[PDB]
Amino acid sequence: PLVVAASIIAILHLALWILDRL
């Protein structure tokens, strides 16, 4: 479950980081 939680946070951060810079 920590692997899943960390991966979700990492992917959300990636998506938001890209969005901000589009």
Per CB under 6 A, residues contacting ligand BOG are: 1, 3, 9, 12-13, 16-17, 20
What is the Cα–Cα distance from 4 to 20, expressed in whole angstroms?
24
DSSP result, the chain: -HHHHHHHHHHHHHHHHHHHH-
Least separation, in Å, of the C-beta of 13 and ligand BOG? 4
Least separation, in Å, of the C-beta of 14 and ligand BOG? 9
Amino acid letter for position 20: D
Q: Which residue is nearest to ligand BOG (CB)?
A: 20
Least separation, in Å, of the C-beta of 18 and ligand BOG? 8
